[PDB]
Amino acid sequence: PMFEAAYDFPGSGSPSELPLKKGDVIYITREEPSGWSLGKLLDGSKEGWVPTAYMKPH
Amino acid sequence: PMFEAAYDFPGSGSPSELPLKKGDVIYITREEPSGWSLGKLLDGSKEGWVPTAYMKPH
């Protein structure tokens, strides 16, 4: 589904992360019990993991 | 269980949130499917919610 980032997520540098700025809209495809969700900001480019905590309905 | 903060969590100013610095040791008492975990720092005054994504083994 589609979510908007409710917090900034600069990340750590990990290539597995998807850095977010608050307000960014992205498509989440998977949500894992570790507390991470896999998303793609909407052009089809960059995919990676973001905190589920930070995803608000859009 | 006991964890360590894997990332800084400044939060939004919400009274529900427990701001963290990376490396902070926290005891989590609840973990909810929304992606948030409730706990208290080893110091152990204020309890509040943090991203489950940011919890790692200490």
UniProtKB/Swiss-Prot annotation, chains A, B:
It comes from the Eukaryota. Present with 2280 molecules/cell in log phase SD medium. Interacts (via myosin motor domain) with SHE4; this interaction is important for proper localization and may regulate the interaction of the motor domain with actin. Interacts (via SH3 domain) with VRP1; this interaction is required for localization to sites of polarized growth and may regulate the interaction of the tail domain with actin. Interacts (via SH3 domain) with PAN1; this interaction is important for late stages of endocytopsis. Interacts (via SH3 domain) with BBC1 and LAS17. Interacts (via C-terminal acidic tail) with ARC19 and ARC40; ARC19 and ARC40 are Arp2/3 complex subunits. One of two redundant type-I myosins implicated in the organization of the actin cytoskeleton. Required for proper actin cytoskeleton polarization and for the internalization step in endocytosis. At the cell cortex, assembles in patch-like structures together with proteins from the actin-polymerizing machinery and promotes actin assembly. Functions redundantly with LAS17 as actin nucleation-promoting factor (NPF) for the Arp2/3 complex. Motor domain phosphorylation by PAK kinases CLA4 and STE20 promotes CDC42-regulated actin assembly. The myosin motor domain displays actin-stimulated ATPase activity and generates a mechanochemical force. This is Myosin-5. Changing residue 36 to S: Abolishes interaction with BBC1 and VRP1. Belongs to the TRAFAC class myosin-kinesin ATPase superfamily. Myosin family. It is found in: Cytoplasm, Cytoskeleton, Actin patch. Phosphorylation probably activates the myosin-I ATPase activity. The chain holds residues 1088 to 1145 of 1219 of the full protein. Residues 1-58 form the SH3 domain.
